[PDB]
Amino acid sequence: RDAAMQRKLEKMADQAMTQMYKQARSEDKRAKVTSAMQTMLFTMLRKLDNDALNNIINNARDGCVPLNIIPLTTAAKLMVVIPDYNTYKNTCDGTTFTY
Amino acid sequence: RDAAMQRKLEKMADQAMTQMYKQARSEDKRAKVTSAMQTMLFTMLRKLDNDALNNIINNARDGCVPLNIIPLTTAAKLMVVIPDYNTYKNTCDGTTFTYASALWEIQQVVDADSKIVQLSEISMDNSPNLAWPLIVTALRAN
Amino acid sequence: KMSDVKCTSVVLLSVLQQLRVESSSKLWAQCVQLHNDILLAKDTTEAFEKMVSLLSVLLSMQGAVDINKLCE
Amino acid sequence: AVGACVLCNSQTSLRCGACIRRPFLCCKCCYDHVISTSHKLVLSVNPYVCNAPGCDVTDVTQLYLGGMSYYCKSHKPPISFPLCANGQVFGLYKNTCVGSDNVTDFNAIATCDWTNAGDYILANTCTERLKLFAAETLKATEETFKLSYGIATVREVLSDRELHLSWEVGKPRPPLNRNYVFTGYRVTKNSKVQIGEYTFEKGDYGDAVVYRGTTTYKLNVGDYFVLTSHTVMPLSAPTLVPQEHYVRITGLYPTLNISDEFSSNVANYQKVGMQKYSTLQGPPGTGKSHFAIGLALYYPSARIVYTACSHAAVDALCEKALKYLPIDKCSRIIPARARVECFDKFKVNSTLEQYVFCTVN
Amino acid sequence: VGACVLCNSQTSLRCGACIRRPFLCCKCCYDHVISTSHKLVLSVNPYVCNAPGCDVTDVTQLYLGGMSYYCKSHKPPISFPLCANGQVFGLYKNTCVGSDNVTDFNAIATCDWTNAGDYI
Amino acid sequence: EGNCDTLKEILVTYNCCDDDYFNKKDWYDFVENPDILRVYANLGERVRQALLKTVQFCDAMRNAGIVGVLTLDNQDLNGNWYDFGDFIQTTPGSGVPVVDSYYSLLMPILTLTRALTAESHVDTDLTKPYIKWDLLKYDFTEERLKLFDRYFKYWDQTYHPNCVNCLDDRCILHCANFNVLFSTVFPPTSFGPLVRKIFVDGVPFVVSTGYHFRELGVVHNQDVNLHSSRLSFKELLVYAADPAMHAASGNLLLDKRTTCFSVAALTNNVAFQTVKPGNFNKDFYDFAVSKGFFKEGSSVELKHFFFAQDGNAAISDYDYYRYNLPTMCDIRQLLFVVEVVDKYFDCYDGGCINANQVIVNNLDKSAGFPFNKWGKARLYYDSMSYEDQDALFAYTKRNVIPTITQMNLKYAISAKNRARTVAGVSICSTMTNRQFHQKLLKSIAATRGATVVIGTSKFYGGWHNMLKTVYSDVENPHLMGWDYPKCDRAMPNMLRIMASLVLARKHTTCCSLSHRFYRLANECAQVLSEMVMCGGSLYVKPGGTSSGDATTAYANSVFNICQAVTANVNALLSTDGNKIADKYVRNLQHRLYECLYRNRDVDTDFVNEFYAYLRKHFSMMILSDDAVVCFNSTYASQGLVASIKNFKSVLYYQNNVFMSEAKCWTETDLTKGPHEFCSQHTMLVKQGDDYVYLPYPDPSRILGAGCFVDDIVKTDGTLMIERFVSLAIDAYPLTKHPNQEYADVFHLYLQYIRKLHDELTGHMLDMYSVMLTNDNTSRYWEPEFYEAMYTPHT
Ligand SMILES: Nc1ncnc2c1ncn2[C@@H]1O[C@H](COP(=O)(O)OP(=O)(O)O)[C@@H](O)[C@H]1O
Ligand SMILES: [Mg+2]
Ligand SMILES: [Zn+2]
Ligand SMILES: [Zn+2]
Ligand SMILES: [Zn+2]
Ligand SMILES: [Zn+2]
Ligand SMILES: [Zn+2]
Numbered sequence A: 001r002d003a004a005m006q007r008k009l010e011k012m013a014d015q016a017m018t019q020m021y022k023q024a025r026s027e028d029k030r031a032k033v034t035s036a037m038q039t040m041l042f043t044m045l046r047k048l049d050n051d052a053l054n055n056i057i058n059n060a061r062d063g064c065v066p067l068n069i070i071p072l073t074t075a076a077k078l079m080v081v082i083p084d085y086n087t088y089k090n091t092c093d094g095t096t097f098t099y
Numbered sequence B: 001r002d003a004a005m006q007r008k009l010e011k012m013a014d015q016a017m018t019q020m021y022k023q024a025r026s027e028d029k030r031a032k033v034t035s036a037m038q039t040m041l042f043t044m045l046r047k048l049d050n051d052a053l054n055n056i057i058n059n060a061r062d063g064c065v066p067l068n069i070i071p072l073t074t075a076a077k078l079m080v081v082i083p084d085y086n087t088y089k090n091t092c093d094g095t096t097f098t099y100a101s102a103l104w105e106i107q108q109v110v111d112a113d114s115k116i117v118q119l120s121e122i123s124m125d126n127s128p129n130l131a132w133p134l135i136v137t138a139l140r141a142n
Numbered sequence C: 001k002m003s004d005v006k007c008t009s010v011v012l013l014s015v016l017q018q019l020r021v022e023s024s025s026k027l028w029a030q031c032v033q034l035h036n037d038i039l040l041a042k043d044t045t046e047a048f049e050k051m052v053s054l055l056s057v058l059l060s061m062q063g064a065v066d067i068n069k070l071c072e
Numbered sequence D: 001a002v003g004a005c006v007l008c009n010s011q012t013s014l015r016c017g018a019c020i021r022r023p024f025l026c027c028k029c030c031y032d033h034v035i036s037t038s039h040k041l042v043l044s045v046n047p048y049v050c051n052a053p054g055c056d057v058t059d060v061t062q063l064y065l066g067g068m069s070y071y072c073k074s075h076k077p078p079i080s081f082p083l084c085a086n087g088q089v090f091g092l093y094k095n096t097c098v099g100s101d102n103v104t105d106f107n108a109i110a111t112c113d114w115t116n117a118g119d120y121i122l123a124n125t126c127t128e129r130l131k132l133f134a135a136e137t138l139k140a141t142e143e144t145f146k147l148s149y150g151i152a153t154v155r156e157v158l159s160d161r162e163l164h165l166s167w168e169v170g171k172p173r174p175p176l177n178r179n180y181v182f183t184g185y186r187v188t189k190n191s192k193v194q195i196g197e198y199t200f201e202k203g204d205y206g207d208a209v210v211y212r213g214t215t216t217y218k219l220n221v222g223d224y225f226v227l228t229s230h231t232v233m234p235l236s237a238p239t240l241v242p243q244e245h246y247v248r249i250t251g252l253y254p255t256l257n258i259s260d261e262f263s264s265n266v267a268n269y270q271k272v273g274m275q276k277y278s279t280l281q282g283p284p285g286t287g288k289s290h291f292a293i294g295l296a297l298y299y300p301s302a303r304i305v306y307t308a309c310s311h312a313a314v315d316a317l318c319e320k321a322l323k324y325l326p327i328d329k330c331s332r333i334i335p336a337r338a339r340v341e342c343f344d345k346f347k348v349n350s351t352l353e354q355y356v357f358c359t360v361n
Numbered sequence E: 001v002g003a004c005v006l007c008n009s010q011t012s013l014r015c016g017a018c019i020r021r022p023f024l025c026c027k028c029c030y031d032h033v034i035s036t037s038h039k040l041v042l043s044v045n046p047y048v049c050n051a052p053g054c055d056v057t058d059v060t061q062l063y064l065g066g067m068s069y070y071c072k073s074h075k076p077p078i079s080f081p082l083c084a085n086g087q088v089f090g091l092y093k094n095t096c097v098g099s100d101n102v103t104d105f106n107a108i109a110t111c112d113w114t115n116a117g118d119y120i
Numbered sequence F: 001e002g003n004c005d006t007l008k009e010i011l012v013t014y015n016c017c018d019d020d021y022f023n024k025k026d027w028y029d030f031v032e033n034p035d036i037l038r039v040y041a042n043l044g045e046r047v048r049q050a051l052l053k054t055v056q057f058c059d060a061m062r063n064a065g066i067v068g069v070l071t072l073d074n075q076d077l078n079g080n081w082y083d084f085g086d087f088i089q090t091t092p093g094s095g096v097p098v099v100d101s102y103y104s105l106l107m108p109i110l111t112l113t114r115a116l117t118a119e120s121h122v123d124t125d126l127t128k129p130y131i132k133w134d135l136l137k138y139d140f141t142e143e144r145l146k147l148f149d150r151y152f153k154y155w156d157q158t159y160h161p162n163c164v165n166c167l168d169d170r171c172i173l174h175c176a177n178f179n180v181l182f183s184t185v186f187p188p189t190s191f192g193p194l195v196r197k198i199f200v201d202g203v204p205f206v207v208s209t210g211y212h213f214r215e216l217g218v219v220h221n222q223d224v225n226l227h228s229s230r231l232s233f234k235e236l237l238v239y240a241a242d243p244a245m246h247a248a249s250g251n252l253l254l255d256k257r258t259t260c261f262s263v264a265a266l267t268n269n270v271a272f273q274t275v276k277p278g279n280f281n282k283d284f285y286d287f288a289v290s291k292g293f294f295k296e297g298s299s300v301e302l303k304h305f306f307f308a309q310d311g312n313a314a315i316s317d318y319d320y321y322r323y324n325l326p327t328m329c330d331i332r333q334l335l336f337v338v339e340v341v342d343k344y345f346d347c348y349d350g351g352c353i354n355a356n357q358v359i360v361n362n363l364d365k366s367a368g369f370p371f372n373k374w375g376k377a378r379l380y381y382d383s384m385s386y387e388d389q390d391a392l393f394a395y396t397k398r399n400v401i402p403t404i405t406q407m408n409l410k411y412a413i414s415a416k417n418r419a420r421t422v423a424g425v426s427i428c429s430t431m432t433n434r435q436f437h438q439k440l441l442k443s444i445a446a447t448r449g450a451t452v453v454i455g456t457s458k459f460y461g462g463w464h465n466m467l468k469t470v471y472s473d474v475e476n477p478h479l480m481g482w483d484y485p486k487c488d489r490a491m492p493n494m495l496r497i498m499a500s501l502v503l504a505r506k507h508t509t510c511c512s513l514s515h516r517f518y519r520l521a522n523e524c525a526q527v528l529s530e531m532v533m534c535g536g537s538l539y540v541k542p543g544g545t546s547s548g549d550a551t552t553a554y555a556n557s558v559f560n561i562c563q564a565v566t567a568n569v570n571a572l573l574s575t576d577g578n579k580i581a582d583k584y585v586r587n588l589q590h591r592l593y594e595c596l597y598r599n600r601d602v603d604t605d606f607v608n609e610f611y612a613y614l615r616k617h618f619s620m621m622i623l624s625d626d627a628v629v630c631f632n633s634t635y636a637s638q639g640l641v642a643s644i645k646n647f648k649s650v651l652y653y654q655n656n657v658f659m660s661e662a663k664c665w666t667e668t669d670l671t672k673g674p675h676e677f678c679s680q681h682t683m684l685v686k687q688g689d690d691y692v693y694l695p696y697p698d699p700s701r702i703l704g705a706g707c708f709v710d711d712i713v714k715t716d717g718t719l720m721i722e723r724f725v726s727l728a729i730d731a732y733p734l735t736k737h738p739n740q741e742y743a744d745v746f747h748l749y750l751q752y753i754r755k756l757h758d759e760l761t762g763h764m765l766d767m768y769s770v771m772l773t774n775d776n777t778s779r780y781w782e783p784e785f786y787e788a789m790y791t792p793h794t
């Protein structure tokens, strides 16, 4: 009878132990969601690796960002900030901005 | 029996006591919601008793009137939501206009983000520059 | 491929939301429109161009640092 | 969140509730703490109080881990483990931690009140982690005591800078100084709202006092002022972390032949260049702070940053530097307080110039 | 629910014999019950034998027979006396400290306020 | 749409529209090109002239003493009559005509073309202004009687303009039909609740004392207290639930986004709700792509995601209510069909119960506009004693309590960008409806082997049992299934009233006539058409079933049965009797026409015979607006039972929606099961010693559910594994599929469950200390545990 009661107490203690462990895991995960998503996104981006994608990624990493949403039609305007001159020779040659 | 009956009494007493503690909590919450009821009811009514309501109720044959007319005659503030510029063109042009057989004066114009807009900004060319559930509150001009 | 384009679009929209981009009504509307367009695409060219247009939204704002998180 | 044992450096989900800063304590570690000192309050994922309605049991020595919930002896479930048993306290990962030995000194620091030099010296001999914990709890203790200062009320408002003030009966009157900013509130029946923060100074006599006005009100006779709080933040890094040094051309490119007269502390310059960190004690008035510039123009391309705890001292040091240093110098010193003035040369924040100076805080 | 008028201890019971329904803690409620004809006590549930056709109301004769106050005639095999141990069972049965000024409370609860001594 | 030449010719003859109008496709659809209504508008005056000339002709006949019957085929399109062949003579001034067939056949065309628009003008002139009605007028009884006498003079039946005076449900329907016709003339602002300022302890209050329905007329509350001192709990509740004070205290609102009738706002600004996207779960995606999945050309991919919703979407979804239109129904065949459908539900039992017998599930949920600020339904449920509920229920049987219904956006996964919406319902409605309907609902849910299959589980062989029961003795069996485009947003309210009437037929002894009428009035006031708080303002719902109520499913089932039965009746009676097969059916058709348009009261034996005939040659398995039909095919070849074209016609003239036939499916085989039902594809495989039917789901939905989830709920499955257990249970029937990809999906799920479990065990055994003494977790990776879910024994 004492063996039964003690094993019952041990298993209930393990049950409380595991449930509170899961609770703590949930709390910490939902607290850390903020930057995990950013790391997530950048991992997918550096996995997919499309030409224009990584091109504009590097263009932003040097510090060349646009101000408006990039249009897709032949018409419609795009404004891009280029804070140096090397990127000009890289992309902005003559009048042919290759972005 | 001295080591079984006493524990039975302990268990039944404990479960009853938990039950009646829960019942007391229920009574307390009931009282709280009753207070919320009466305070809400008494505080909402003190902003409607225009004598125009008494006027129109007296004009009625016995007192009963359709609900859909009370804010159509006694209400003091009108809010207008405009989908686009063309609707605004022929609905609320000018600083004042009429609707429901009464005059209304434009007071304050907000946008979706609740940012005040000057009436000058509202133009055909400037239209593709604003959030467009325009809200236009107004007063009962007279 | 296309499935990965869809998944990364989902992730991009998810990350854009919590940075309070939805305060700007027209910006959030355009982003939602683009996101729903891609999730019904058929070929990779339209998905790629719509997605680069979408990512220009994140690139224009300076809330997230590029080079620092680009540790590779 | 979950932390790490303040002694065993392994993970932890328990903290000492009755202590101040609540550090994370290993299960056996916290058992020693509780059994060897007066705290009987441990903060796990949930507090430990008898969940019976009407009971007030907060000590951990009489808690039994009942079914999914612990209770007092009058409410303990029959089938219930004891909580603090087997010479340890129940918790997470229990059978994986190690335990430690510096429990007596740790709890002494936790309970020392720093009224004698005995615990001040004891702070500078313990674990660096424990040293930082002691510094944190000492600063927290000092800030908490700052709350003891009483409350000030206006007696009458005479003019722009004439005022009479009544302190609270029996309260320790705080000193009147520039560095003491006090917030003021007004009350009504609904409008208990802030009126502004002001600092005060004694007038020509009596109770006549002067002040300054941050918020522009028509200050009535129904105002009062209390101290403005300032909390403290935890730290992570140690004080003097070393990583040794080399004489394997780890130095930068220094000057060759310049300084004229101060071309003299030369051999020590590259010694610092081949040293991770060192010090130079000096009497007062002697050649320190000219070295603030000899090594400064000896390595002109390096980013050399100075920062003193005293505004007057750092201003004097940067003015010296201004006599003889890279003049494209910015000293990004003062944030938007500007209580006591400083240098009048450059802007407030550049974070780009190599010889910027500031305040430690 | 409140502090007893004789102990300031948090109770939930009021004497049914008193018109003013005074809060009384288990110890002081028991003292007042035994010190006068105050055999009526009101709580979350009125201390009356809730049996079909029963009329007994005194806490002394009542027994906690299951989920119902019961006398001896209407009791089930298991019962429990409420008015026992110098403190009737109820809310916070542990923290009922008892009172010293009991008899003055009883005389107050029973005097007709006719003699000058009552006003004294 | 394949043969509508006569209608095109008629339309182009009378300048209804130009012939070029028939080039733009879907000119005949309502949802597509809703301008068609403006075409059918230019036929109303012709119909009105025809009605006037019919009245004149009947008057002349009764003056000159003739006896006979009139039928539509005699009158030309200008009103003139002819063909007096079968008229007899009597004494002058005593001749009587018979016109029930005429009017009853004509009825649905009246509102379709909007014949009675000219009654709203100044002097029944289309070239004149509108009658400027008085704002406070709310009775209109005399105008109802005027119109009914001016157009329907010789209709030989009592018509009460106010349905509260009717004698039975038959009279209720007969009067409500006319009410539906007439009340399209009166101004819209004079419908809804009736308010009356009362005083309690010297305080002004605005309450509601009655309602003025679009089809039931005027109902006045019986027990109304004008002056009082203090209020109890029940009165507080009924006053807080009312929309009266919220509407009055609010401000005037004009909304130019929608076309529905606004009422007022409550705050000084407007909310703009949005639906944020879902959360991704990479590790599952990696585990899936590793085992060779998502390759190009494979017959499985993702078609189920978390679509994002922008700002003004709640209103643009509410705007779909504009598809609800007023509609008359032929009263005669409607009464017959409801009689048959009542004959269907004769194997259950209903009645009023007490508060103690009630059963409530998941009490911790919301409660409406008032009351959603303070706890959940559990709070109000506990706070009130049993006598409180009994008194509240007894009160509603003698009064009317309008409520407000909160609108909300859903958050789930589907395959199209169209939004979704739930509706929060007030709490008093819930208590009352539960106490009134619970017994019958339980009786319906528990019964096995009937036309309605609500409450029958697809596990443990139930699916096969149902598929066998629908497979009755059908001589040339086939399978046919159809669909209802926008069933909830286009329901005509007459059928909804009749459905709520059918459910109440069991209350024969528990309730009196007046109590039954008041319960029906309460139901109409609370669920059918009432004030919908969307955004932050109030609106008015024209009609159509809600979603947050507790009887939508049963109501939709009854509606579906009625649709099918009336389509069968229509199909049988439009066939020449000179080329019919064996006498029996031709005699039955003759008897049907007689019992439909000539007999006045009900005839039970013919009802039993027709019900038996339908059971013989038409078997239906019915869920809420979803059904599968097994019907004899040789009969349908001659058009003696239902067919898809009949359903198209019935929907077109009775619900104002064009159900395109490309959506239906028709199956000739019976080895394979129904092509689709409740989003399950039926497959026949060998289990044990014989062949059984198993329901297997689409794989793509399962994969999408595995990949995209909310946050932490499955962002790391290690915390909660029972999700993948439950997903796998529904994915098991994919094993027996001939194509092997689906078995691969099932195996991938098993592998992932195993990996998750073992890595959790490692995580807790290594960094923590103790987990394991007995495993008992083997069962979650062998098919032996799963296949017990389909073994016909439990
Ligand atoms: N190379 C030098 N030639 C002449 N005078 C010097 C030289 N170095 C320092 N001094 C004088 O010695 C003093 C040293 O004081 P300072 O540099 O301010 O050090 P500290 O900060 O310890 O007083 C200076 O005031 C300076 O005038
Ligand atoms: Mg004819
Ligand atoms: Zn401590
Ligand atoms: Zn430790
Ligand atoms: Zn306790
Ligand atoms: Zn008493
Ligand atoms: Zn007491």
Ligand SMILES: [Zn+2]
Pocket (backbone or CB within 6 Å): E049, E050, E051, E054, E055, E056, E070, E071, E072, E073, E074, E075
């Ligand atoms: Zn008894």
Ligand SMILES: [Zn+2]
Pocket (backbone or CB within 6 Å): F158, F159, F160, F163, F165, F166, F167, F171, F172, F174, F175
């Ligand atoms: Zn009638």
Ligand SMILES: [Zn+2]
Pocket (backbone or CB within 6 Å): F351, F352, F507, F510, F511
């Ligand atoms: Zn009933």
